[PDB]
Structures are given as structure tokens and as C-alpha cells.
Amino acid sequence: AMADMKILRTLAGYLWMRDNPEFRFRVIAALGFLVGAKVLNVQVPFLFKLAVDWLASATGTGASLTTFAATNPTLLTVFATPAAVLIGYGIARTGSSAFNELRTAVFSKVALRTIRSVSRKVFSHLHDLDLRYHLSRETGGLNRIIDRGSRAINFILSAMVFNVVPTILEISMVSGILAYKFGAAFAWITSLSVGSYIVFTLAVTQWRTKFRKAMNKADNDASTRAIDSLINYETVKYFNNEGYEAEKYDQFLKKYEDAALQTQRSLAFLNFGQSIIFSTALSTAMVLCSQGIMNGQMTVGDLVMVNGLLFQLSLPLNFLGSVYRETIQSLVDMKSMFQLLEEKSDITNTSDAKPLVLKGGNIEFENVHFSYLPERKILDGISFVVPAGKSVAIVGTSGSGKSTILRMLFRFFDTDSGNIRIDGQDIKEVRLDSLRSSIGVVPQDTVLFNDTIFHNIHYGRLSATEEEVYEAARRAAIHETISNFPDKYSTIVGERGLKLSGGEKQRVALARTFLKSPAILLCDEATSALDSTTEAEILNALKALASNRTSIFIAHRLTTAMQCDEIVVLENGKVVEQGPHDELLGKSGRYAQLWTQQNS
Amino acid sequence: AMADMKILRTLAGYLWMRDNPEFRFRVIAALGFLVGAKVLNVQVPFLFKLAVDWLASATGTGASLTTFAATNPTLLTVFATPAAVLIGYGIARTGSSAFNELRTAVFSKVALRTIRSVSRKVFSHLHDLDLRYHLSRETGGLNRIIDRGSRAINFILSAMVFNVVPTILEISMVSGILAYKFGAAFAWITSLSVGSYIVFTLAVTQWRTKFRKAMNKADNDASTRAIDSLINYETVKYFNNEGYEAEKYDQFLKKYEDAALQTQRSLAFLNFGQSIIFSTALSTAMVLCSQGIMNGQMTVGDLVMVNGLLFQLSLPLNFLGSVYRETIQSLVDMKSMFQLLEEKSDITNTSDAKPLVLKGGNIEFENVHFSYLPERKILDGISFVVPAGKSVAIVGTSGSGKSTILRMLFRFFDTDSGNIRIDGQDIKEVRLDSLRSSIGVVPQDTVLFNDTIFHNIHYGRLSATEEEVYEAARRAAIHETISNFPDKYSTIVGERGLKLSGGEKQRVALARTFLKSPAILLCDEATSALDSTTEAEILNALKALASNRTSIFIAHRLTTAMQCDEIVVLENGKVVEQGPHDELLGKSGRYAQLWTQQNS
């Protein structure tokens, strides 16, 4: 899995921010606080060797004339009386646990920042991605991917920095104390012991996982069975109630109670050998030291430190055994996330950027063909020309697939062989931002976020004052229905708020697009059915809004939009008729039947 | 909360099964394996005091003429050479960890059995409960209650037996070692220390919980916000994409990154004071022992055991601090479960039990009134008499609420002021089992469990042979459609199986009630709409089945069931018309309009 190492490389690439000097200093401090602690925690038993001696010298009849043999602690520190050394022992160990605990605090303000930068970058890249990717993927999946990946990053960094590195620095240093009070043969025994212990725990965890999975399977089966059985209460009650039902549930719970009694004996074998494997080490160490003591070796009274060193090693070893499943799962979730990234968008623009300079809006289509799939090609050469400042209507059946128009004009999908003339300019060259900003559109379904009305009504253009939004309201003719707001026009809307019917939601859409003050207006049959009183007035409002801007309206219903200058009949995904509606009715064409059946 | 102690009393009541001798023996063995371990784990440092001595006697110039002062270990055990004592140390501690681990295995085969008995009893009591309780309560809730309660029982028993009892036996015994090498003042210091440590950890955990809740709130808010934002991609894309959106998500993730950086410093204070509070104890103990050593007290070289005893106490203390939330939550979930139990069913029967001896079925209703709610009383004195072996039809509108009939005849709900004559007998006296067994009914919706066809087809009466189910199939006329089964008539059905249409499901219902061979047949308009070919034949089949048994059919549609002898019109929950259908059509009554609009 070479790509897995590559993913680690990417993680290192993102982790290190050269740009800012402070980050490096933070990391350095962290490392310092990781070393200091782990050397005080070895000073602790050396202080317990020093305090066992001198105590024995007095009353014990130990040779007092040994002066200061080692001469390493010749400093007057902790030599006032033996009680001082014991106090130093306590202070030392407490300070070690302080340094080590402090390191975590120093390194979490770094971990959080890393997670934040990766998540923000992924978010922005996601929105940059083209529509096709979003449509194919499931909405829930994106959530799962981001949350699990961020959690995985946090877990892996904490697991490594706080567990893998301290354990190995500890073991290496302890075995590296071979310079003093040690022999070459003696040092290897502890390393071999700990290596065997780690191998045994890691190997037996794999075995444990199978039993855990079997138990989860059985438990889920029993629960689902007893829920299916409870749900279908009526059938059971009518005839032979709980006659043969309880016995069957009993059998399921016997299978569960056996698959659960098995895992205990399996954990038992591990939790026993995890003791014996580490006890043989301590027995071997002590018996070997005793032989030296009784054989007149330099070792005198220093047996008491070995217990301490072994205890220090014994504490954090257990964590390493159980990290395998988490590591593999996190390391594949991280590949998932970093695979979501680095996916290029289909709709690339050319290098040179030219801004859309549109004096007046003219829509000219020239043999635009587009097939979503090879079998069915939606548009088969639609060509029409809209005069500036006029209204043109696109009508047809629902099979005609007139949804594409909006997607194409917004450059969601590109044309296989055609062009789009905007004020006699080619869209392929102009910047995406300039075009999407200069065009105005009203959505078909007006989804509102959960926030204050004033935010959902100034959303169209930010930096909107209260007077601007007021003038938009007045033209939107919403003041009659807005003075009843419970929170003086700040009432919360959306979920956990006042539910809005379609008419007000449409008014909100109008009072959101009126703010933007666009150059061209495009509609997508916002309302399918509505009360007559609201329809008429909203139609008048949108007619007034569209008076100074060239507009294009796509309406499945005919009577709804008859006010345009020309009407483009669309049937079987091609241009059928181009004229004012009256001779369309008089041509016995598609428009004629559709309208004559709309009124009937 | 006196009732909480009462709940503990109930738990003790259920835990102890006097009936079986083996259970007590198991529990006794468990307790033994809980004592032995916890006394070997105190033998361990005594063996490390014994091995520190004698080693010092040689080469150390220790007085060899002290003979055997204590005379407690005068046994020749572990006196071959000092190496033997070290080996004994290792073997002892390993054996302690074996005994203690073994206890868990011995006590889990008891815990599982307890959980099983409580769950099975609750299940049966649940099914015993009347319909009203089931209808009011939510189906999901019952699941949640059972699963959480069983988990709580397991957690509380394991938590107490494995943690609370060992910790207190350990502490009490250690402080109880006051007989040897101790003073009255010295013993109290350790108890005061550990008591202060437990108080500090418990108190500061409450504080930690508030920060954890704030963090969970903030995390959920950030996630829900970013999902709402991702979902509404279109609105964002049309205008000012990620212009002001990213900054707002950023602010949410700043709030999260602060509420998460706060909890670390809060945990930090706990994880530091949990060290200093326990370090002051060790420093005080050692300095006090050193004063004795230097003052010519009996204590000689036994300082090395105190470290071990303190370490043994230090290991399992941490668990007790975090158990508060789990204990309170489990202790209230247990009250939930034991509150579900001991709820009596409304439909009690009288003491004396008389069996239903029905020579022939005669249905006689006499002024039966029943109101589900005081406002609307469904039945207002329905009285009619069915002759034996005949077919009678109950017809009406959907507002007439004719659903009650089935519930009442099955004695789901009792009559406020009326009686039901079954073969000239009163239902109130006869046993519920006898009546519900002697009556036959076909369900309206035929829910099938996920199992083999042969099980879903012999379900009506257990102990059904292959020939019995074959004859039921032949009369059910299902052999034509059954020889196509992929698994030679053992094909799985239900979910994750072959989906069945309404016609086959109805055939299954017929081939389930035909098995039971009841004395009286009752229908509940099983089919609302179906293909003509199946309807006709299934009607013929049910006519043949009902020929020898008196039958009652409730049909909302009129043309569907015209074959009965008499027809009972029901309108506004009262008997309107009683006759053969032809003069019902000729009476211009409810039946006449209903049928004339069914055919139109």
C-alpha cells in the first residue's frame, strides 16, 4: 500500500506551516515538555536508590567511611537529612507528572488548528466541485466522510504523540542505562521480554475481535427478533398467544448467553498470559541481581530500583495492544477524505480572463446540442433570438425535459457542439464569476434557512441597509403582512419557527431577487398551484420587476404565462413553434391543444 | 427516594434463587475467589520485605545471629536460598492475579442467568398486558426500556462486585494491618488521605460534566449547521457562492474550538490534583517511617513494603471516581423497567373457571353499550340473534366505526352495561383461553414473519404434519402456484425474500385459519380491492370453508358480501335494518343507497 505512505506524506505536508514562526516554537516547546517529564520519571527510582542507602549506613552498621563514592550527586542538594531525599522523591515524581500532563495542553491547541485548516479547505474544495459530483453522491455520505476523517486525524495524532513516542523513548532510555550498573547480557533480557509481550498481546487481539463480532451479530439478531415479535402483537393474541413464541425467544437468548460466556474465557486467556509473560521478566531480573549482590559485585542495595523501572514500563504498555483496529480504520478513513480532495472540476475556464461587458442583454442560441446520456439527447439544435428588454416564453410538456435550460444558461453543463451568444459574446471565454453574478434568477423551490426574517430577506446581496431592504419590501408589497411579526420583524423562521405557506415563501423569493438588482431575469415556474388572490398580485409584481430587464419564463402551464412577446413551443426536445400565442392557438399546434386543455 | 432502596430490595429478591442448591454454591465459590486473590496481593509486598532482609544480612554485615525473630515463616518454604524468595514473589503475585481474574469468569455465568430470567419474565408479563397499554405506548420505547434496563443490570452488578467490594476490602485490610509494624496515629493518616482523594475526584467530576455537555451541544450545532448549508447547495451557487457562508461556518468552528480547548484545562486541574493529593500521602508515610528507623524502633528495612501497599491501593481507586453518572442513570432505568412490571391487566376474570361447552354457535346480543371515550359512545344497544350454522352480514359506512365488533367479540374490551350470549352462556364467567381458542378469525392485514413458507403456513396450529398442511393446501387451491417455489416449498419469505402480493398473502391467511379448524368463523373485510380472478375464487373458498360453521362478515363494500342470510345495517353506531338485502334495497334505506352507489 505505497499510497498509504503517500497519505502519511500528505499529512506531514499539511501539518507543517512554515509560513508562521510561532507554530514551530510551539512544537519545540511540546517536544521539550515530552523529554523533561520522561527523564524525571527515571530520576524517581534513582532517588529511591539514593534514599535506601545512607539510611542503611546508620543503625544498619553500613560503612560510613565510604565518603561519597559516586560523586555525581556531590551537590549539597537533598543532603540535609534522609527525610529530605524522600521529600525530593515526592516532588520529583509529582513534577514529572506535571510536565507530562502539560505537554498535552500545549499540543492540543496545535491539533485543533490542524483539524480546522483541513476541514475548511475540504469544505471550500467541495463547493468548488461541479454539480455532477454532488448529484451522484449521497448527502449523508459526505457528512459521514468529513466527521469520521476529522475524528480519525485527531485520534491518530493524539495516539502517536502521546503513546507511541513516550513508550519507545522510555524503553530505549531504560535499556540505554547500560552504562551504569549493568551488563551486556542483562540489558538484552528486558528488551526481549517486552518484545515478546507486545507480540503476544497484538496477536491475541486479532483472535478476540472474531468473538466480539459474533457477539454483536447474535445480540442484534435477538433484538430484531424480539422487536418483530412485539410489533406483531395482534396475530399472536388472536390464536395460541405465547404458546410457542416464548420458547423461540428463549432459544435466541440461549445462543446469545453462550456467545457471551465464550468471549469471557477468551479474554481470560489474554488477561492471564499478559501477567505470566511479564512476571517471568521480574523474577529473572531479581534473581540475576541477587546473584551479583551475593557475589561481591559493585551492585549494593540497588535491587529496589529495578522494581520501579519495571513498574514504569508496565503502566503504558497496555494501550499499544488495542490500537490496531483504530489505526487501520482511521488510516483508511483518511484515505477516503484525501481521495475526496484533489478531484478536478469538469468546467474549467481558459487561462485568459475577460470580463463580461454587456450593454444590453441579447440571447442568441445557435444549434446548441447537449446529451445528458448517449441514449437521449435533450436539445437538438434549439435556435432563437431574444430582443433586448423583452419577454419570451418557453412552453412545453413535462416529457420535453425543459429543466435543462436553467442549468445550461448558468453554465452548469457545457455544449458538445454549440455556442451561446450573450450580447454577441462567447461564454467560453468570460469568467464564471462575472457571468453568474451579472445574471439574475428566481428559484423554483424557495428553501429558507433557519434564521431571522431580516437575514432571509437581505440574503440576496450582503451589505444591505435597513432602507434598502425597506424599499425592497415596499415594492414587494409585503408591509401589509409584515407588521404582524411577533418579534418586530425579527421573528425566527424555518424549523423551530413559524411555518410559512407557499405564497409567503414566493414573496420572500421575490424580495430576495429584487435586492440583487440583476441585468437579466430568468424564471423556472416557481409556483405550480396557488390561491388566485396571491397569484394575480405576485404576477403583477414580477411583471413590474421585469419591465426594464429582458426576461425568459419557462411555464408548464400556458394560461399562467401569456404576457410575453413571443412563445417558444418545445416538444420532443426541439423548437416547434415561434410566435405570439394567438396564431399558435390557430395553428392547431402543441400550444393550441395544451392551452385548450388547460382551460377546457 | 425510599422507592430506590425498595428497588434494590426487589433486585436482591430476584437475584437469590433458593429453589436450586447449585446457585448458592456458585456464589460461595465466587466470594472465596474474591478473598483469596485479595490476600495474596498483600502477601506480595510481605514477600518483598522478607527478601530485602537476609540479603542484607550477608555482605551487608547484618547481624546473622538474629536467628528467626518473627518465627511466623518458620516453615522451610522459600528458605533454600534468597533466589527462592524472589521466585516465590513472582509466583505469588501471578497467582493472585489468576484467582482474581478467575472470579470474573465464575460470576458472569451467574450474571447472564439473572439477566435472562428478568428479561423473560418481563416479556411474558408484557404480552399478558391488555391492549390499551400497548396502543398508548410507542413501539420504540418498549425496546429502549428493555435493552437499557438489561444493560444497566449487567453494568451495576459488574461494577459493584468487581470494583466497590474489592476496593473496600483492600483499604480496610491494609489499614487493619495495624496489629503489626504500626501505630494508632499512623493508621489514620492513610485512611484520611484516601478519603480526601475520593472526595476530591467525585466532586470535580460533577464540574467536568458541565463542560462535556457544552462541548457536545456546540459540536452538534456546528454539524447540523454545516449539513443544512451543504444540502442547500443550489441557493448558494446561484448568487454570491461562499462569499459570506464560509465566514459563518468559521465562526461556528471557532466556538467549538474554544469550548474544546476549555475542557482540556478543566481536566488538567483534576489530573494534577489527583497526583499531588496522593503524593503528599507517600511523602508523609516515608518520612514518618524514616524517623522510626533512625530512632531505633522495631521497624528495620520494611520501608520498601509501604511503597508496594500504596501502589496497590493507587491502581483501582481511579475507577470509583467516574461511576457516578453511570450509577444514577442505571438506577433510574432500573426503576423504569420495574415500573413497567407490576401493572395489572384490566380484563380480570372471576375466581371460578368454567369451560366453554358449546354444542352449537348462537350469537345473541342484548343492549350491549360500549364507549371508548365519554364524548362518543360507539354502540347504542345493538341487539340481534344469529341462527346456528348461518351467515349474517354487518354493513355500514366508515364513520360508523364497525371496527369495534371484532375487538368486543374477542373480549378485548368489556361492556359497560350489556351481556354477550354464546350458546346461551355468559362470557364473563368462561375462561379467556377457552373462548379465544374456540373462536376462529381471519385478520384484515396478514403480516407474515420472515421465515420459511412451511412455517408461515403451519403457524395456525402447531404439531402440524406434512399431510395435514398438504390437505390444507389442496382445499386452499394453492398447489398450482406452489410448485414453482425455488427451494422446493421451503423458500424464505418476508424481508430479504420473495415479495408477496395481496392475493397470495390472503391465500396464506386462508391456509392459516383453515388449519385451526375452528367452531365459528369471523371476517374483517380482509381485502379492500383486488383483481377479479383471485377475488372470485377466494370468495368461493371462504364460502366452502364457512359452510359448516356459523359466520359473521363485516364488509364496507356491499356487492362484495351479498351471500349471507341476513344483513345488519349499521349507521351512526346503531342497528338500523335487519333483513335480506332485496327489501333493504327496496326500503330506500342506508343499504339501498350504499349498494346503488357501489354499482352506480
PDB file of N, CA and C in Angstrom, chain A residues 349-406:
ATOM      1  N   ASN A 349     -12.140  26.896 -17.049  1.00  0.00           N
ATOM      2  CA  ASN A 349     -12.114  28.036 -17.949  1.00  0.00           C
ATOM      3  C   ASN A 349     -10.718  28.201 -18.534  1.00  0.00           C
ATOM      4  N   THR A 350     -10.640  28.967 -19.619  1.00  0.00           N
ATOM      5  CA  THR A 350      -9.364  29.209 -20.270  1.00  0.00           C
ATOM      6  C   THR A 350      -8.488  30.117 -19.408  1.00  0.00           C
ATOM      7  N   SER A 351      -7.200  30.156 -19.751  1.00  0.00           N
ATOM      8  CA  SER A 351      -6.240  30.946 -18.986  1.00  0.00           C
ATOM      9  C   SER A 351      -6.637  32.418 -18.966  1.00  0.00           C
ATOM     10  N   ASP A 352      -6.716  33.037 -20.143  1.00  0.00           N
ATOM     11  CA  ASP A 352      -7.057  34.450 -20.230  1.00  0.00           C
ATOM     12  C   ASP A 352      -8.468  34.695 -19.708  1.00  0.00           C
ATOM     13  N   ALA A 353      -8.607  35.719 -18.870  1.00  0.00           N
ATOM     14  CA  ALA A 353      -9.882  36.106 -18.278  1.00  0.00           C
ATOM     15  C   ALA A 353     -10.344  37.440 -18.851  1.00  0.00           C
ATOM     16  N   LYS A 354     -11.539  37.454 -19.437  1.00  0.00           N
ATOM     17  CA  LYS A 354     -12.133  38.660 -19.989  1.00  0.00           C
ATOM     18  C   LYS A 354     -13.450  38.951 -19.282  1.00  0.00           C
ATOM     19  N   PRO A 355     -13.680  40.181 -18.829  1.00  0.00           N
ATOM     20  CA  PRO A 355     -14.906  40.474 -18.080  1.00  0.00           C
ATOM     21  C   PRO A 355     -16.087  40.713 -19.007  1.00  0.00           C
ATOM     22  N   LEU A 356     -17.261  40.276 -18.561  1.00  0.00           N
ATOM     23  CA  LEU A 356     -18.477  40.423 -19.356  1.00  0.00           C
ATOM     24  C   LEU A 356     -18.890  41.890 -19.387  1.00  0.00           C
ATOM     25  N   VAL A 357     -18.695  42.540 -20.528  1.00  0.00           N
ATOM     26  CA  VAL A 357     -19.137  43.919 -20.734  1.00  0.00           C
ATOM     27  C   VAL A 357     -20.397  43.851 -21.597  1.00  0.00           C
ATOM     28  N   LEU A 358     -21.552  43.857 -20.937  1.00  0.00           N
ATOM     29  CA  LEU A 358     -22.839  43.723 -21.609  1.00  0.00           C
ATOM     30  C   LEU A 358     -23.600  45.043 -21.530  1.00  0.00           C
ATOM     31  N   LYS A 359     -23.690  45.737 -22.664  1.00  0.00           N
ATOM     32  CA  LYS A 359     -24.503  46.947 -22.726  1.00  0.00           C
ATOM     33  C   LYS A 359     -25.987  46.604 -22.635  1.00  0.00           C
ATOM     34  N   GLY A 360     -26.415  45.589 -23.372  1.00  0.00           N
ATOM     35  CA  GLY A 360     -27.800  45.151 -23.349  1.00  0.00           C
ATOM     36  C   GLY A 360     -27.858  43.655 -23.549  1.00  0.00           C
ATOM     37  N   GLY A 361     -28.866  43.028 -22.951  1.00  0.00           N
ATOM     38  CA  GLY A 361     -28.947  41.582 -22.997  1.00  0.00           C
ATOM     39  C   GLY A 361     -29.653  41.048 -24.225  1.00  0.00           C
ATOM     40  N   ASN A 362     -28.926  40.271 -25.027  1.00  0.00           N
ATOM     41  CA  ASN A 362     -29.472  39.606 -26.202  1.00  0.00           C
ATOM     42  C   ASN A 362     -29.135  38.127 -26.113  1.00  0.00           C
ATOM     43  N   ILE A 363     -30.157  37.279 -26.125  1.00  0.00           N
ATOM     44  CA  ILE A 363     -29.979  35.838 -26.003  1.00  0.00           C
ATOM     45  C   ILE A 363     -30.077  35.247 -27.402  1.00  0.00           C
ATOM     46  N   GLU A 364     -28.963  34.723 -27.911  1.00  0.00           N
ATOM     47  CA  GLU A 364     -28.920  34.095 -29.227  1.00  0.00           C
ATOM     48  C   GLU A 364     -28.375  32.679 -29.112  1.00  0.00           C
ATOM     49  N   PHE A 365     -29.201  31.696 -29.457  1.00  0.00           N
ATOM     50  CA  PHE A 365     -28.812  30.291 -29.442  1.00  0.00           C
ATOM     51  C   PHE A 365     -28.560  29.826 -30.871  1.00  0.00           C
ATOM     52  N   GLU A 366     -27.465  29.097 -31.076  1.00  0.00           N
ATOM     53  CA  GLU A 366     -27.079  28.621 -32.405  1.00  0.00           C
ATOM     54  C   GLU A 366     -26.735  27.134 -32.341  1.00  0.00           C
ATOM     55  N   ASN A 367     -27.705  26.290 -32.703  1.00  0.00           N
ATOM     56  CA  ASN A 367     -27.511  24.843 -32.833  1.00  0.00           C
ATOM     57  C   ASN A 367     -26.853  24.247 -31.590  1.00  0.00           C
ATOM     58  N   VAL A 368     -27.384  24.609 -30.428  1.00  0.00           N
ATOM     59  CA  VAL A 368     -26.886  24.077 -29.164  1.00  0.00           C
ATOM     60  C   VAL A 368     -27.428  22.666 -28.976  1.00  0.00           C
ATOM     61  N   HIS A 369     -26.528  21.691 -28.896  1.00  0.00           N
ATOM     62  CA  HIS A 369     -26.894  20.313 -28.618  1.00  0.00           C
ATOM     63  C   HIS A 369     -26.258  19.878 -27.306  1.00  0.00           C
ATOM     64  N   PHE A 370     -27.011  19.134 -26.500  1.00  0.00           N
ATOM     65  CA  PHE A 370     -26.497  18.640 -25.229  1.00  0.00           C
ATOM     66  C   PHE A 370     -27.205  17.340 -24.888  1.00  0.00           C
ATOM     67  N   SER A 371     -26.432  16.285 -24.642  1.00  0.00           N
ATOM     68  CA  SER A 371     -26.982  14.997 -24.243  1.00  0.00           C
ATOM     69  C   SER A 371     -26.475  14.659 -22.848  1.00  0.00           C
ATOM     70  N   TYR A 372     -27.405  14.517 -21.901  1.00  0.00           N
ATOM     71  CA  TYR A 372     -27.038  14.071 -20.560  1.00  0.00           C
ATOM     72  C   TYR A 372     -26.517  12.641 -20.603  1.00  0.00           C
ATOM     73  N   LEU A 373     -27.101  11.814 -21.459  1.00  0.00           N
ATOM     74  CA  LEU A 373     -26.707  10.429 -21.631  1.00  0.00           C
ATOM     75  C   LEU A 373     -26.763  10.149 -23.125  1.00  0.00           C
ATOM     76  N   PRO A 374     -25.975   9.189 -23.625  1.00  0.00           N
ATOM     77  CA  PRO A 374     -25.969   8.952 -25.081  1.00  0.00           C
ATOM     78  C   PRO A 374     -27.316   8.548 -25.655  1.00  0.00           C
ATOM     79  N   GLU A 375     -28.108   7.762 -24.922  1.00  0.00           N
ATOM     80  CA  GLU A 375     -29.392   7.302 -25.449  1.00  0.00           C
ATOM     81  C   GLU A 375     -30.315   8.468 -25.800  1.00  0.00           C
ATOM     82  N   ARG A 376     -30.517   9.400 -24.872  1.00  0.00           N
ATOM     83  CA  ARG A 376     -31.455  10.503 -25.058  1.00  0.00           C
ATOM     84  C   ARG A 376     -30.694  11.822 -25.081  1.00  0.00           C
ATOM     85  N   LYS A 377     -30.737  12.514 -26.216  1.00  0.00           N
ATOM     86  CA  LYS A 377     -30.157  13.845 -26.347  1.00  0.00           C
ATOM     87  C   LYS A 377     -31.279  14.878 -26.238  1.00  0.00           C
ATOM     88  N   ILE A 378     -31.207  15.703 -25.189  1.00  0.00           N
ATOM     89  CA  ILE A 378     -32.299  16.615 -24.840  1.00  0.00           C
ATOM     90  C   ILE A 378     -32.540  17.645 -25.938  1.00  0.00           C
ATOM     91  N   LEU A 379     -31.525  18.444 -26.249  1.00  0.00           N
ATOM     92  CA  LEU A 379     -31.665  19.565 -27.170  1.00  0.00           C
ATOM     93  C   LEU A 379     -31.090  19.210 -28.532  1.00  0.00           C
ATOM     94  N   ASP A 380     -31.878  19.443 -29.583  1.00  0.00           N
ATOM     95  CA  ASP A 380     -31.464  19.045 -30.921  1.00  0.00           C
ATOM     96  C   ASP A 380     -31.311  20.244 -31.847  1.00  0.00           C
ATOM     97  N   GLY A 381     -30.574  21.259 -31.415  1.00  0.00           N
ATOM     98  CA  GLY A 381     -30.321  22.421 -32.233  1.00  0.00           C
ATOM     99  C   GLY A 381     -31.194  23.630 -31.981  1.00  0.00           C
ATOM    100  N   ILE A 382     -31.639  23.850 -30.742  1.00  0.00           N
ATOM    101  CA  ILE A 382     -32.520  24.975 -30.446  1.00  0.00           C
ATOM    102  C   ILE A 382     -31.842  26.272 -30.871  1.00  0.00           C
ATOM    103  N   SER A 383     -32.500  27.023 -31.752  1.00  0.00           N
ATOM    104  CA  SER A 383     -32.020  28.337 -32.162  1.00  0.00           C
ATOM    105  C   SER A 383     -33.156  29.348 -32.098  1.00  0.00           C
ATOM    106  N   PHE A 384     -32.955  30.408 -31.321  1.00  0.00           N
ATOM    107  CA  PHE A 384     -33.891  31.522 -31.249  1.00  0.00           C
ATOM    108  C   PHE A 384     -33.125  32.746 -30.769  1.00  0.00           C
ATOM    109  N   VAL A 385     -33.698  33.919 -31.024  1.00  0.00           N
ATOM    110  CA  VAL A 385     -33.072  35.187 -30.674  1.00  0.00           C
ATOM    111  C   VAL A 385     -34.078  36.021 -29.895  1.00  0.00           C
ATOM    112  N   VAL A 386     -33.656  36.525 -28.747  1.00  0.00           N
ATOM    113  CA  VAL A 386     -34.489  37.364 -27.888  1.00  0.00           C
ATOM    114  C   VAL A 386     -34.057  38.814 -28.071  1.00  0.00           C
ATOM    115  N   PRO A 387     -34.975  39.732 -28.357  1.00  0.00           N
ATOM    116  CA  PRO A 387     -34.606  41.149 -28.393  1.00  0.00           C
ATOM    117  C   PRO A 387     -34.416  41.699 -26.990  1.00  0.00           C
ATOM    118  N   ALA A 388     -33.595  42.742 -26.895  1.00  0.00           N
ATOM    119  CA  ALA A 388     -33.259  43.316 -25.599  1.00  0.00           C
ATOM    120  C   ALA A 388     -34.491  43.900 -24.918  1.00  0.00           C
ATOM    121  N   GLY A 389     -34.566  43.710 -23.602  1.00  0.00           N
ATOM    122  CA  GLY A 389     -35.642  44.266 -22.808  1.00  0.00           C
ATOM    123  C   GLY A 389     -37.018  43.698 -23.067  1.00  0.00           C
ATOM    124  N   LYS A 390     -37.114  42.504 -23.646  1.00  0.00           N
ATOM    125  CA  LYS A 390     -38.402  41.911 -23.973  1.00  0.00           C
ATOM    126  C   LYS A 390     -38.615  40.637 -23.165  1.00  0.00           C
ATOM    127  N   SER A 391     -39.837  40.116 -23.236  1.00  0.00           N
ATOM    128  CA  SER A 391     -40.227  38.895 -22.545  1.00  0.00           C
ATOM    129  C   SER A 391     -40.523  37.800 -23.558  1.00  0.00           C
ATOM    130  N   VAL A 392     -39.902  36.636 -23.374  1.00  0.00           N
ATOM    131  CA  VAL A 392     -40.117  35.484 -24.239  1.00  0.00           C
ATOM    132  C   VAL A 392     -40.453  34.284 -23.364  1.00  0.00           C
ATOM    133  N   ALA A 393     -41.335  33.418 -23.858  1.00  0.00           N
ATOM    134  CA  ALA A 393     -41.874  32.327 -23.060  1.00  0.00           C
ATOM    135  C   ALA A 393     -41.509  30.984 -23.676  1.00  0.00           C
ATOM    136  N   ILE A 394     -41.064  30.063 -22.826  1.00  0.00           N
ATOM    137  CA  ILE A 394     -40.708  28.702 -23.215  1.00  0.00           C
ATOM    138  C   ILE A 394     -41.757  27.764 -22.635  1.00  0.00           C
ATOM    139  N   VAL A 395     -42.495  27.075 -23.504  1.00  0.00           N
ATOM    140  CA  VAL A 395     -43.606  26.238 -23.070  1.00  0.00           C
ATOM    141  C   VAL A 395     -43.444  24.844 -23.657  1.00  0.00           C
ATOM    142  N   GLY A 396     -44.012  23.866 -22.965  1.00  0.00           N
ATOM    143  CA  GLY A 396     -43.989  22.500 -23.442  1.00  0.00           C
ATOM    144  C   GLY A 396     -44.557  21.560 -22.403  1.00  0.00           C
ATOM    145  N   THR A 397     -44.492  20.273 -22.732  1.00  0.00           N
ATOM    146  CA  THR A 397     -44.938  19.220 -21.835  1.00  0.00           C
ATOM    147  C   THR A 397     -43.876  18.944 -20.774  1.00  0.00           C
ATOM    148  N   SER A 398     -44.194  18.032 -19.853  1.00  0.00           N
ATOM    149  CA  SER A 398     -43.222  17.626 -18.846  1.00  0.00           C
ATOM    150  C   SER A 398     -42.227  16.611 -19.393  1.00  0.00           C
ATOM    151  N   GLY A 399     -42.644  15.786 -20.354  1.00  0.00           N
ATOM    152  CA  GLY A 399     -41.713  14.896 -21.023  1.00  0.00           C
ATOM    153  C   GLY A 399     -40.639  15.618 -21.810  1.00  0.00           C
ATOM    154  N   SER A 400     -40.898  16.865 -22.212  1.00  0.00           N
ATOM    155  CA  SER A 400     -39.961  17.622 -23.034  1.00  0.00           C
ATOM    156  C   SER A 400     -38.668  17.965 -22.303  1.00  0.00           C
ATOM    157  N   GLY A 401     -38.603  17.743 -20.993  1.00  0.00           N
ATOM    158  CA  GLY A 401     -37.400  17.996 -20.224  1.00  0.00           C
ATOM    159  C   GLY A 401     -36.856  19.408 -20.305  1.00  0.00           C
ATOM    160  N   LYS A 402     -37.720  20.407 -20.118  1.00  0.00           N
ATOM    161  CA  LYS A 402     -37.313  21.802 -20.236  1.00  0.00           C
ATOM    162  C   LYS A 402     -36.507  22.284 -19.035  1.00  0.00           C
ATOM    163  N   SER A 403     -36.202  21.393 -18.089  1.00  0.00           N
ATOM    164  CA  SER A 403     -35.389  21.755 -16.934  1.00  0.00           C
ATOM    165  C   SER A 403     -33.975  22.152 -17.339  1.00  0.00           C
ATOM    166  N   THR A 404     -33.466  21.583 -18.436  1.00  0.00           N
ATOM    167  CA  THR A 404     -32.069  21.784 -18.814  1.00  0.00           C
ATOM    168  C   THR A 404     -31.732  23.259 -19.024  1.00  0.00           C
ATOM    169  N   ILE A 405     -32.645  24.032 -19.620  1.00  0.00           N
ATOM    170  CA  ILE A 405     -32.442  25.444 -19.954  1.00  0.00           C
ATOM    171  C   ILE A 405     -31.732  26.196 -18.832  1.00  0.00           C
ATOM    172  N   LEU A 406     -32.271  26.111 -17.612  1.00  0.00           N
ATOM    173  CA  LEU A 406     -31.696  26.847 -16.487  1.00  0.00           C
ATOM    174  C   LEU A 406     -30.270  26.404 -16.211  1.00  0.00           C
TER     175      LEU A 406
END
